[PDB]
Amino acid sequence: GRPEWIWLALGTALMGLGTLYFLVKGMGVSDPDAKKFYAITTLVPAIAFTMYLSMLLGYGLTMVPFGGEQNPIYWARYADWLFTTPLLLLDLALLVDADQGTILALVGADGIMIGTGLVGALTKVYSYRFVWWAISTAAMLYILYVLFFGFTSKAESMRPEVASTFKVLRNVTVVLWSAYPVVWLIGSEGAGIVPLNIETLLFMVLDVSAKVGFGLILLRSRAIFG
Ligand SMILES: CCCCCCCCCCCCCCCC
Ligand SMILES: CCCCCCCCCCCC
Ligand SMILES: CCCCCCCCCCCC
Ligand SMILES: CCCCCCCCCCCC
Ligand SMILES: CCCCCCCCCCCC
Ligand SMILES: CCCCCCCCCCCC
Ligand SMILES: CCCCCCCCCCCC
Ligand SMILES: CCCCCCCCCCCC
Ligand SMILES: CCCCCCCCCC
Ligand SMILES: CCCCCCCCCC
Ligand SMILES: CCCCCCCCCC
Ligand SMILES: CCCCCCCCCC
Ligand SMILES: CCCCCCCCC
């Protein structure tokens, strides 16, 4: 009875339902281009379902000493994000036909974001937790910069309906993603202001929006068809 359990349970349910809905729709499509978007986009909440379920059952949680106390850190979030965040970037890349080398650079940056975020989360010297946070946030900002300036440029060579879908998904991504570093800084991993139960609520809202919300928008569009 960690009080955050309720949001881990709701997160589990929403990621599950979203995965099932997307699989059902995905299995029914025959267009090859649309299939690739369905495969990527169904896997996103499926992974998140597995990690939410794991946390709900008490796995992916460790205690890290800093600031003179033992602090609960959910590390399973990073195992989700490691794979889900680049898959979302891959959906955006495929929509705008990004260059292969831009994709690699973004996936690289994304692994740096998640891996330095996790190192920060497990670091025992309080000050140095923020150093890793800042490196992670830099990597995130590079990603957003590229999505905002580079991908929008590529998108403008596409038909308007593809460009328009990309722009909504870009906007969703920039708003949601930019919130994660702030939650971490003020929550249990950082300054310890916002209690773990509220923090789990906030990451559940963000996660569901960034995966299922995003997917609803992408998979209902005409832009994914060939
Ligand atoms: C040659 C121009 C280089 C531009 C340098 C920008 C550095 C700071 C970027 C901070 C990220 C902003 C993200 C924008 C996303 C909406
Ligand atoms: C206590 C919170 C968990 C709620 C679980 C709901 C499970 C799926 C509901 C299906 C209804 C559409
Ligand atoms: C219920 C779990 C579903 C996850 C399916 C997504 C994976 C797509 C693989 C690509 C098909 C060859
Ligand atoms: C083709 C490029 C491969 C890896 C690129 C990494 C991009 C910069 C990350 C900034 C982190 C602070
Ligand atoms: C007392 C020591 C000063 C601490 C330095 C803080 C620097 C903030 C820079 C943030 C980089 C993104
Ligand atoms: C002891 C004085 C240290 C003050 C450092 C402040 C400058 C932070 C630089 C961050 C640049 C990104
Ligand atoms: C609209 C944002 C409201 C921010 C709430 C501030 C949290 C203050 C905590 C006081 C510590 C006991
Ligand atoms: C035990 C909890 C005491 C502090 C309450 C602060 C709540 C912060 C929520 C801010 C939302 C952004
Ligand atoms: C004590 C109440 C236990 C109920 C657990 C419900 C979680 C279900 C996830 C769908
Ligand atoms: C929603 C589709 C089912 C995903 C199966 C994976 C379950 C592993 C949880 C530990
Ligand atoms: C007190 C330690 C500060 C050193 C942090 C330097 C990190 C820059 C790497 C990108
Ligand atoms: C301490 C109670 C205040 C927290 C409310 C947080 C609202 C988040 C909704 C997305
Ligand atoms: C990915 C770059 C690693 C830089 C490490 C700085 C941490 C020193 C406390």
Write the CATH number for 155.
Answer: 1.20.1070.10
In short, whether 158's Cβ falls inside 6 Å of ligand 1 is no
Domain range holding 24?
Answer: 1-226
What are the beta bridge partners of residue 63? 72
- Ligand 8 close to Cβ of residue 144 (< 6 A): no
Q: What domain count does the chain have?
A: 1
DSSP state at residue 156: T
Please name the method used to determine this structure.
X-ray
Question: Distance, CA 97 to ligand 3 centroid (Å)?
Answer: 22
Which ligand lies nearest the alpha carbon of 187? 8
Distances from the Cα of 101 to the Cα of 2, 104, 106, 114, angstroms: 44, 5, 9, 20
Torsion of CA 160, 168, 146, 100, to 10 degrees: -60
What secondary structure does DSSP assign to 46-84, as a single string? HHHHHHHHHHHTT-SEEEEEETTEEEEEETHHHHHHHHH
| Residues having CB within 6 Å of any atom of ligand 4 | 101, 104-105, 108-109, 112, 135, 138-139, 142
Q: Which of 118, 125, 127, 132 to mutate to test the pocket of ligand 13 (most atoms within 8 A of CB)?
A: 132
- CB distance 113 to 143 below 8 Å: yes
Ligand 7 midpoint to CA 172 (Å):
25
| Atom 6 (ligand 3) nearest CA | 43
Resolution (A): 1.4
Nearest to 103 by CA among 113, 94, 112: 94
